[PDB]
Amino acid sequence: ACARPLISVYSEKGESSGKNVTLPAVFKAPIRPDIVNFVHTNLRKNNRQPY
Amino acid sequence: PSRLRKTRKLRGHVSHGHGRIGKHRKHPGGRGNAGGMHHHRINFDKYHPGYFGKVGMRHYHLKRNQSFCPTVNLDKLWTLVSEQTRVNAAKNKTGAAPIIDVVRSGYYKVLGKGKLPKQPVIVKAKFFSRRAEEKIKGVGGACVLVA
Amino acid sequence: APSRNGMILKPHFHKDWQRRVATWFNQPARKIRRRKARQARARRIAPRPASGPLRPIVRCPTVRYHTKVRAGRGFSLEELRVAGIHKKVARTIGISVDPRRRNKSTESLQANVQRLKEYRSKLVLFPRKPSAPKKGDSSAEELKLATQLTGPVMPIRNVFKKEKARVITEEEKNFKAFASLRMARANARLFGIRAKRAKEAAEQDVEKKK
RNA sequence: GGGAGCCCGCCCCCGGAGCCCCGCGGACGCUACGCCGCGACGAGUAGGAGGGCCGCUGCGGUGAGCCUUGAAGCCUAGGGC
RNA sequence: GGUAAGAAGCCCGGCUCGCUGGCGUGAGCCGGGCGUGGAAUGGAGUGCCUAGUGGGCCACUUUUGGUAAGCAGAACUGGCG
RNA sequence: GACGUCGGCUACCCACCCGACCCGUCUUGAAACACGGACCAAGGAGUCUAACACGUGCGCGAGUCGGGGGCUCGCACGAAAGCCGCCGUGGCGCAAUGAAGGUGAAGGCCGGCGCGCUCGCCGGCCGAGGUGGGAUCCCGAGGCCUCUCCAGUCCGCCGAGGGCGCACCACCGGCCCGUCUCGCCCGCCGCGCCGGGGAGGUGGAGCACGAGCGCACGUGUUAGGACCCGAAAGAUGGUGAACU
RNA sequence: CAGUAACGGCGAGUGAACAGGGAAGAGCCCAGCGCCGAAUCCCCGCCCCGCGGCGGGGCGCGGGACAUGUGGCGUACGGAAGACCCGCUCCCCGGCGCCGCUCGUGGGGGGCCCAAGUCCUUCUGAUCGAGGCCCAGCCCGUGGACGGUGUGAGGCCGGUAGCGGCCCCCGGCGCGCCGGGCCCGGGUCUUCCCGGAGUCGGGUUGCUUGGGAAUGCAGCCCAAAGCGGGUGGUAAACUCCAUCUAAGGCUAAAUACCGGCACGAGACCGAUAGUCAACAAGUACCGUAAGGGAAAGUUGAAAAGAACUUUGAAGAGAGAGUUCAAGAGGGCGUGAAACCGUUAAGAGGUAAACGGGUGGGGUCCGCGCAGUCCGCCCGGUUCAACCCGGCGGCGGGUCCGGCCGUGUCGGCGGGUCCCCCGACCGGCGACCGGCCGCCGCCGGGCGCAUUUCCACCGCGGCGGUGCGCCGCGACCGGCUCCGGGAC
Ligand SMILES: [Mg+2]
Ligand SMILES: [Mg+2]
Ligand SMILES: [Mg+2]
Ligand SMILES: [Mg+2]
Ligand SMILES: [Mg+2]
Ligand SMILES: [Mg+2]
Ligand SMILES: [Mg+2]
Ligand SMILES: [Mg+2]
Ligand SMILES: [Mg+2]
Ligand SMILES: [Mg+2]
Ligand SMILES: [Mg+2]
Ligand SMILES: [Mg+2]
Ligand SMILES: [Mg+2]
Ligand SMILES: [Mg+2]
Ligand SMILES: [Mg+2]
Ligand SMILES: [Mg+2]
Ligand SMILES: [Mg+2]
Ligand SMILES: [Mg+2]
Questions:
Q1: Which run of H or E residues covers position C96?
Q2: Which residues of A spanning 3-42 put their CB closer than 7 angstroms to strand F?
């Protein structure tokens, strides 16, 4: 359970309103560039037509 | 990725890594498992003992459903039931001895491997072994046969 | 040629297999076509269930499973007779009927009859014409719902009965499961030969009489 | 902390002792996959391994990239790495 | 050409034995005490995959057949390959 | 020394001294009186699928999985992506051993009941044995000191010595299945050509507090056309007596 | 399931089925057995409807087929007929027209259309280029795909998006009418009925299969029965069990689709590649024939395709002209190498060519009309120092106060997920409001021994260097020698 601050929402013209939302725990997940690169490279081949 | 493969490093070399005295021919020794008795006998006899020959009785129409009998050891028997059932044991001062059905979890035969905790159980199974029954009786349980 | 302890492998690629290679690039198009056909068929029968007719309760053979319950092809004629539904009428109301299925056990018969009764209870029989004839439901339960029934009708669930903790007596403790199994196997193996020996002894006594 | 020594007290802090060590903060050195110092060694066919900011083509991102005030390609007794 | 030049070695005390024995052996288990075991040089041990090779030749020395051979055939070592 | 003078290693041409035989290949041996080769441009030969084994990276982990199917989009990017009482039908692993009928992995200690009979039966206790080597961790006398003598809790380094001892190796024991020998007893719904247990050898791809599953990369061996080019052949179906 | 059971010089190799999870799911009809007066069917004539996938009805002692068997009931899940228990009477075919335009969110086909710069400068032969235009800039945007237009265009044009519009045809679902066909049930009981022959099966031999004392298909021979027959993966006898009813027939869906019709797409090739064929390609051409089978794209934006003068018989040139460019001139974009002619330079009796080291001559390159190269410190017009106000920032702790936030304790107050105050601790960069110290900026002072720019005479101190050719001194390291003395 990492420290998750509060993120302020903004209106259609900027000028952040009074509503606030706590940071979801997904943004505190570990950053794994190798895993992202592996998954992206293996997944980008699935939309490929045969030749 | 052919980029990382060995063929890229062999460009410029005459023999391509297959020797210049003995070239890379089609099938110098034969195709497949040829020569298990002649000229390849040493490999078969020193790495696959019992390859040649026939042993045992034949079974023409063999069905795997008849011989289906999964086994579970007493080492992991309380895992088939929820942990709260095991927590509600050695308690209530009555000797509840909850019933464990292994056919429900997908097991027919109960084997005696492992150590059973000191708590009475009711074990219902298609078949039982002598050691498993001895362990269950010693712990303080009972074995029940179910068809 | 073998080389220092590899597996002995026998690939089945000695025929002209490249002539009969079946690719699966058609798989997403096949799934889309199946989904479109399924949606069109569901739309064609607007109030009827999209899955189709009700299926009976069936237990599986082949002792491997021996305990799972799945959907059958159709209700047997005995079940229809007990439930009181004509075999020719039943197929017109959404009840699967097949005439090959036998009926050995009373429990399966009763379970299927109860299932048929439950299905009949929750059935909305629309009138043939706008005017309501006999056996047609009231117009109150006709505008209340006219939608499909997603998924199988009355889905089959393999339900188990929980057993309460017991008060085990000495009789259960004294029971010998392994010995009983061994004795049962021996009796099954030796029944015929023991009968033959008994017959031989009886014949010996009879020939001693005369 | 006490008892004392070849009348008592101080015997102080680097925002300053100013340095061949400064335990108070620390590169010009820190693309830590980086940088720096010591020693020994350097043949090679068949073959094996590693590094290529060596080269070609196309795809996903990225250079607020280049370009009719001139892209690719080609020629060059020009300047270099 | 084999061995030995010590800690995996010696010296005591006590247990076990369906083995062998007159008492005894013999082996195995536990407790305790004693450390540079000739010279000189090296850091060692261990596990997986694994290509190529499987036509050789020459020379000092020993040596078989042959009159002999830049002949054919062996042993040790060193080279060319 | 500075308006016809400077520096330009490399490249343009020429000269001199030394060295210097044409490349690729078979080969013990090639410059060979061995083979291929006039010259130039373009193309040109270790690939892909499947099955294995090992190594490496990632995720989960006694579990792991997406095959196929289904629900969301009318496909720009998409035939992608997200999800599933389908999360598991099913595969692999978690249990092996016999041809099979089948069987199927824990023991030890303590007190008692039979004569402790290295054998059977009752209650409690410890719960993968022991030996040797074992990276690391624990205790650790004492020493090193500190502007003088003593006392002294504290921050240290070394620390003789004494221990718990990972992983792994070697050995001695234990357990499971088949088989051989010698044997004594236990139970019943049916007392039998019933079933079960012991000790001592041996055979097994076993247990002895687990490590697999899926994806990706590389190497090696194969089936395929199988690194590329090359026959003398064989078979099936058709066309020719305009030559002879 | 499963590379499994099994087959196989049990070698190489071959190799299913059941169950389970799914996609889809739909059941039926004869002969025979029997009951109905052949109650059945086809053809020709006339009348009425519609007739471009020739039908329905009526009128015909008009014909034919059929008793050597048509039609109705009825088929293994039993059927038929009576008895009498129960509630009651709409399905299909052919036409006549009609309203809703019927999901890719208006079903299919076709036709005609629907937003916004050619805005101001500036390049160019020509912009679709560049800069700018009430906010990345001017306007549209449910339209920022694509193609064409003299380059590289959201707004020039066609299109693109749209539950956008209009105009015709077709298909499908529903409404009213006409012609009709149709007197069509369930449960119990009682009485009768209920089966496909040269076929099964057996022997045999050949082929086939995983099927092994023979899986299936077969030529030949034998050749049936009816509580019978078939199957129960080892041949045979006896004995019980389980499961179907063969030798007659029909049927969509989930499945396959290198040919045909019409579309869409690509991490594919880019004219020796990709189909043989990007082009008058299965064409030219070859063979008697079966057959074999190519090579071959590119001017230019626009032909504006060179008028006209001159030599030559002409092919060919010299002028002129077009074009941005013919230094693009009809096989014409770019135009390499092999090879050839000429021009400029060098050289030449051991074939040429090559490696190492210099020299000479050319080609241009970089200087320079000295290049003595700078960069700091020192000597010879305003503000820093110091105050006032404002602004922003940094760090700190009494945690000064609250939030924030981690572990425990308390209120059980709402196995895992939440609320309130109080205490301790990690107060962790998770935030503020005040306090202190400091920093920077702006505005006021601060008028000149301080402060800051420019140029010079110092080569004064430091650092890297000199435009090229050099020379000298001292110190060190490693070598080759020489002269002495002393044991
Ligand atoms: Mg379904
Ligand atoms: Mg060689
Ligand atoms: Mg050879
Ligand atoms: Mg030779
Ligand atoms: Mg050579
Ligand atoms: Mg030649
Ligand atoms: Mg090439
Ligand atoms: Mg291998
Ligand atoms: Mg060939
Ligand atoms: Mg032959
Ligand atoms: Mg398998
Ligand atoms: Mg009839
Ligand atoms: Mg355009
Ligand atoms: Mg455009
Ligand atoms: Mg427009
Ligand atoms: Mg049998
Ligand atoms: Mg071509
Ligand atoms: Mg040209």
A1: none
A2: 32, 34-35, 38, 42
Resolution (A): 2.8
For residue B66, list chain C residues with Cβ-Cβ distance below 8 A.
63-64
What stretch of H or E contains C89?
A: helix C87-90
Closest C-alpha to C68, from C59, C77, C76: C59
3-state secondary structure of B119: coil
CA gap C127, C135 in Å, rounded: 8
What DSSP character marks residue C18? G
Using the Cβ of C2 and the Cβ atoms of chain B, whether some distance falls under 8 Å is answered with yes
DSSP string, B29-88: S-STTTTTTTTSHHHHHHHSTT-SS--S---SS--TTTT---EEEGGG-GGGS-HHHHHT
Nearest chain C residue to B46 by CA distance is C5
Solving technique:
cryo-EM
Q: What is the DSSP string of C123-138?
A: -----SSSS--TTPPP
Helix (H, G, I), strand (E, B) or coil at C13: coil
Using CA coordinates, name the residue in chain C closest to B111.
C178
Determine whether the interchain pair C1/B65 forms a contact, defined as Cβ–Cβ distance below 8 Å. no
The percent of chain C in helix, strand and coil, each rounded to the nearest 5, is: 45, 5, 50
Could you say which nucleotides of strand G lie within 7 A of any protein CB atom? 1-7, 10-28, 77-78, 87-91, 103-104, 186-188, 210-212, 233-234, 243-244, 254-258, 265-268, 404-407, 415, 428, 430-431
* Residue written as token pair 């706590």: A22
Tokens for B96?
């509840």
Q: For residue B111, report the phi and psi dihedrals to the nearest 5 degrees.
A: -105, 160
